[PDB]
Design an enzyme around this catalytic site. Sequence first.
Site, PDB file in Angstrom:
ATOM      1  N   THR A 539       0.835  -1.206   0.000  1.00  0.00           N
ATOM      2  CA  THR A 539       0.000   0.000   0.000  1.00  0.00           C
ATOM      3  C   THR A 539       0.869   1.254   0.000  1.00  0.00           C
ATOM      4  OG1 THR A 539      -0.223   0.291   2.405  1.00  0.00           O
ATOM      5  CG2 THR A 539      -1.751  -1.245   1.323  1.00  0.00           C
ATOM      6  N   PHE A 586       6.545   7.338   1.849  1.00  0.00           N
ATOM      7  CA  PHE A 586       5.222   7.451   1.235  1.00  0.00           C
ATOM      8  C   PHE A 586       5.282   7.449  -0.294  1.00  0.00           C
ATOM      9  CE2 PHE A 586       0.775   8.675   0.935  1.00  0.00           C
ATOM     10  CZ  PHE A 586       0.233   8.160   2.104  1.00  0.00           C
ATOM     11  N   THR A 587       4.147   7.762  -0.929  1.00  0.00           N
ATOM     12  CA  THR A 587       3.899   7.470  -2.355  1.00  0.00           C
ATOM     13  C   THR A 587       4.533   6.139  -2.797  1.00  0.00           C
ATOM     14  OG1 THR A 587       4.045   8.292  -4.675  1.00  0.00           O
ATOM     15  CG2 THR A 587       5.686   9.167  -3.118  1.00  0.00           C
ATOM     16  N   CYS A 588       4.809   5.292  -1.799  1.00  0.00           N
ATOM     17  CA  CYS A 588       5.430   3.973  -1.964  1.00  0.00           C
ATOM     18  C   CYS A 588       6.695   4.010  -2.823  1.00  0.00           C
ATOM     19  CB  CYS A 588       4.417   2.968  -2.517  1.00  0.00           C
ATOM     20  SG  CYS A 588       4.361   1.433  -1.588  1.00  0.00           S
ATOM     21  N   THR A 589       7.053   2.870  -3.405  1.00  0.00           N
ATOM     22  CA  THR A 589       8.083   2.847  -4.437  1.00  0.00           C
ATOM     23  C   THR A 589       7.422   3.092  -5.794  1.00  0.00           C
ATOM     24  OG1 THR A 589       8.290   0.588  -5.357  1.00  0.00           O
ATOM     25  CG2 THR A 589       8.975   0.913  -3.058  1.00  0.00           C
TER      26      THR A 589
END
Length: 617
Positions: A539, A586-589
Amino acid sequence: SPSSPADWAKKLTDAVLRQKAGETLTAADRDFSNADFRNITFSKILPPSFMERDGDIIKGFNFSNSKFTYSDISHLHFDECRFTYSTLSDVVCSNTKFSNSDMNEVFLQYSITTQQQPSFIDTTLKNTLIRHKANLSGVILNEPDNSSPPSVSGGGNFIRLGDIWLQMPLLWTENAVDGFLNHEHNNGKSILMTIDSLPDKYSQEKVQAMEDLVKSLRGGRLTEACIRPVESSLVSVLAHPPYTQSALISEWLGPVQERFFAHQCQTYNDVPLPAPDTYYQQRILPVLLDSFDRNSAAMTTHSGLFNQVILHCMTGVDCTDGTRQKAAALYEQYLAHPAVSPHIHNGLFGNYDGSPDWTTRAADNFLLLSSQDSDTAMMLSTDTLLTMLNPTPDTAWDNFYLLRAGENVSTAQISPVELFRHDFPVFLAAFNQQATQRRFGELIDIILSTEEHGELNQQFLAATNQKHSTVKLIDDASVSRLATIFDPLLPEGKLSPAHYQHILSAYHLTDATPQKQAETLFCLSTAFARYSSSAIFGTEHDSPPALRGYAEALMQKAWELSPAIFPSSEQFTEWSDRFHGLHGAFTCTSVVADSMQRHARKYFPSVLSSILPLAWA
C-alpha cells in the site's frame, strides 16, 4: 494535571475488559469526556478480540470533546458512541468502524498513513471535516445549516456532502489530482468513490457534491495532461447514473470521456486488455459500450478494441445484466454492418440464423475484421477467443475459420503468427508476450522453490495478469515469509553470485555485453520494484522490505556493468536509497518503480518489453 493518555488508556481498558466480562457499565463509568489519547497505540493496550473480524466492540462510550491526535484506532469498532466536538485529526484509523454513533462537529482529517479506509454505518457526521475517502454507504445525512466552514491552516474552500464538510485543495497540483481523483492509483480511494458510496437514495445530495467538486476543477485550469492520468478514474464514476443527468457534470465530462475512448482505441486496439477484474467489469465496460454506441463508426474501424470489449462484457462474471444486454445489442449492429454483413453466413456463424448463440461458449459467435484487408475475416468461438486473448502455456492458435470472402480458407500453409502480423495484431501481441511471460515465469520459480512457498509462487505470477493487485503482502506472518526467502538469495546485502548465475542462464543469455546485461536486469529491478509498490503487493506507505532488497540488489548489480545507461550518479544513489528508508516513507516505491520504468521506455525500451509483464506496461 491530572495526567496523560497512559491514564485514560488503562481506564478504557478495564471499562471494556469489564464491559465484555458482562457488567453493564454505569453511564458515569463510561463517560470519557475530554479524554486525552494522543499517540495511544490501542493495538498495544487492548486484547486482539477488539481488532479482528468477528469483533469485540467498544459500546456505549462518551468521548465528547476529546483528543485523539497521532492516535491509532485501526481495526477497532465503535458502537453507540458520542465524539461530538472531538478532534480526530492525524488519527490512523485503518479500517475503523463507527456505527450508531454521533460524530458531529468533529475534526476527522485522519492521518494519510491510514491504509484500509474508515467506515460509518448509521452514524452522523454533521458539520464535520473528513478526508475525502471514507466509506459512507451507511451514513446519515440531514439538511445542512449555515455555520462556518471550519477551517484552520490547510488549503482551499469547502464543499458540502449534505451536512458533511469536505476540503478542496488550495490548487490542483498533479499530486492534488492524484490523492483526490485517482482511485485507481490508490486502491479505490478517492473523493469520487467517497461521495458515490452513499446509499442509492441520497441521490441529490450526491449529484450536488459532485457538481460542486466538478466546479472547483472547472475553476482550476487542468491542461489536457493533468486529467490524462485519471481519464479512467473519473469516467468510472461519472459516466454512470445518477451523474449522467447533471448538466454540468454531463457537459464537463463530455471531452474527458472522448479523450478516454480515443486513448483506449490507440492503446488496446492492436493489444490485449488485461482480463477485466470486478471493478473494470462494473465501471469501465459500460462506458466503452456507451462510447461505441455514440460512435458506431468505431465498432468497425477499431474492430480490435470492440470485439475485446464485447467478449469481456458477455463473459465477465460481475457484469450487470444491462451491460450484457447492451453489449449483445451493439454486436447486432456490427453484425448487420455492410462491412461485416458479407462475412456472416447462415448455416455457419453463431446460431446459424445470423446472430450469436450467447447460450454456449462453443458457438462460433465472433467475427473479427482484418486490419489490412476488409474482405478477409476470422470466425471463432467465445472459448477460443478468450484463450487467444489472454493465452496460456499450451494455448492452441490454429483454431479458427478464415473467411475471404468467400468461404472457408484452408490453413495448414498459413503461419498463424504471420497471419496475426498485419491482419490481427492483437494475437501477435498475445503470442509474442506469452513467450516473454515464460522466461520471467521461470525466475519466479527459481526463487520461490517450485512447490515450496507454492502459495506465494502463484500469488506472484497472478499479480502479473493486471495492473492492480487487491491482495497485499504486509503483516507479520507475511513479512517473515519473504525475509526467509530473499535473505539467503543475497548473502549480506548484494546479489548472491550463485543466483546471478541462475539468472545468467535462465534468460537464455549468459555472455553477451555489459551494456545489454545492465539493461536486462535493470528492467528486472523495475519489475520487482513494481512488485513491492502500491497497486500490487504493497500500500501507498508500506512496501515489502525483502522485495525492495531484491530490487536494490538488482540495480546495484546493474551499476557495475554499464552505469553509462543510467540517468545520473545522483539517481542510482537516490533510488538505491529509497529501497532503504533515507527518503520519507510514502507514495510507496510507486515513484521508484514508475520512474525506473519511465527511464526505460526511453533509452533502451526494447528490453523493457521482454521481462516486464504486459499488464504492468
